[PDB]
Every structure is written in structure tokens, then in C-alpha cells.
């Protein structure tokens, strides 16, 4: 009933019954207003919900909650390079925060049954080659557990 | 290079990846624990940096000041040393116990801070609907002692 949970700093036990609402956040501190930021978040699939339907649901939420949200592209995505790589989808989108036009990539994967793992890159400027390389190397370098 | 870089491996429950050195980790772990009470118990793990000339007790002092602003009827009930892990890798820190009113409901809060990663602070914050008694303190401090630093 106790099972291990790992963070960067070490590891501890949690009851099997827990729900993980952790959000990993990585920023270039002091230069947030020009630099991309990275985010990893977690979610659970609704009954009979597959990953495409999950992404549709999230797209509709962002249309609802964010400023003038617009999806720019949608394509397959992969986290890792081995036979155990996560196979999922990604979108690119923009939305408005005050004067700023925020640019985002988000990639969703079912890492274990019923549980979605979401990688997000957020930039205060349109994507450039540097941001694209960051995004693609981040996903390719991911090493799934187990 | 092929054997490593100034960039740093980073681990989450679901796997690991390389985090470029320029990034600061501001992750917030949130775990909703099992419970049938009106409010669920939860564990929060956050990361912080000490301000210039701020030690760990002073850091705790700063977090209490922020609690008073955001949480209804916040009262500190206890303050004591804390230990995360055991053996040579054990982390010596500090902790508080406190109460506040989440809604119309009284809940019970622990916060324990440590210097796990050199030059950073790791903060465990427990929110529970169940009052702290000797048994609860035992189970909490025993759980802290079981932490295995990386």
C-alpha cells in the first residue's frame, strides 16, 4: 500500500491511493520575459477517453479560459528514443496575456494506464530555431521510468 | 559530451531528462492523499532559495508571515527541529505545526524545511483535516526520517 515516489531531491513513500497534481516548472530566472519556460503536468483520462479526445477536451478548455486562444498546429509527438518511448500528440498555440502574445507547445502522452503526462513550452515571442531545438531535444531525451 | 555536460539530469516519478544548466527548478509537487473528510489531506513540496544572510529559521519565519496573510485564523502551535532521512545523508532542518480554517472547516498544517540540494531549500507542507496528536507526530517524523536524499 506504500509505494515509492521520486523527486529530483530524493525519494519517499506515498500511499497507493494518492493523486499526483505535481507541476514541474523550469524557468530562466531574471530573464523570464524573454526566455522560454518549461512545464510538466499530469491529468487523468475520463472513462472511455483516449488521448485525441483528451487533447480535444484540453483545447476546448483553453479556448474557454485563456485570452484569444488559437491552435496553430497539431502533430504526433514522441518522448524518448527507445522501444519504450511515449507515443502521443502535440499542439502549438498562441494566446494573449495583457499586451503579450504567448506562444506555447504542449505534448500529451499516456505514460501509464489512465494517466496523461503533459510537456509544455511557453515563450513570450514566436518560436525560433533555438526554441524548437530546446523543445525537440527535451522530448527526445526523455527516459521513461520502468 | 557523450559522458556528460554542465547540464543536469533531472528526475520525476515518470522518468528523467537533461535540464539545461541555465534553468532554475520551481517545481511544486502536490499530492492529494486518501480521505473521506470534507477536505482531503494533501502534501506540498516546494523549492526556494534563501535570501542574502537568511538562515533556515529566518526562512521559516518568512513563510509564517506569508501564511498569516493567506490562511484564515492561522496560529502556530509548535516549532521544533526536523530530520529528513537518516545516516550520513540525513538532512537537519526545522518544522512547524499550525492550524487555520480552510473553509468553514478547521484544518491542521505542518511545514518542514531542509537544505537538500546545496544552496536551495526544500519545503514539505502537509495539510490535514485530522488534529495532530502524539501518534500523528510520530508518523510524520518517522515518514520524514524515511526520506532518501539523492
Numbering used by the authors:
A (entry chain B): 1 to 146
B (entry chain A): -4 to 145
Reported in the publication:
One such pathway is the type VI secretion system (T6SS), which in many bacterial species functions to deliver antibacterial effector proteins from the cytoplasm directly into an adjacent bacterial cell via a one-step secretion event. In contrast, DUF1795 proteins, also known as effector-associated gene (Eag) chaperones, interact with so-called ‘evolved’ PAAR proteins in which the PAAR and toxin domains are found as a single polypeptide chain. Crystal structures of Eag chaperones in complex with the TMDs of cognate class I and class II effectors reveal the conformation of effector TMDs prior to their secretion and insertion into target cell membranes.
However, the EagR1 homologue SciW from Salmonella Typhimurium crystallized in isolation and in the presence of the N-terminus of the class I prePAAR effector Rhs1 (Rhs1NT), allowing us to determine apo and effector-bound structures to resolutions of 1.75 Å and 1.90 Å, respectively.
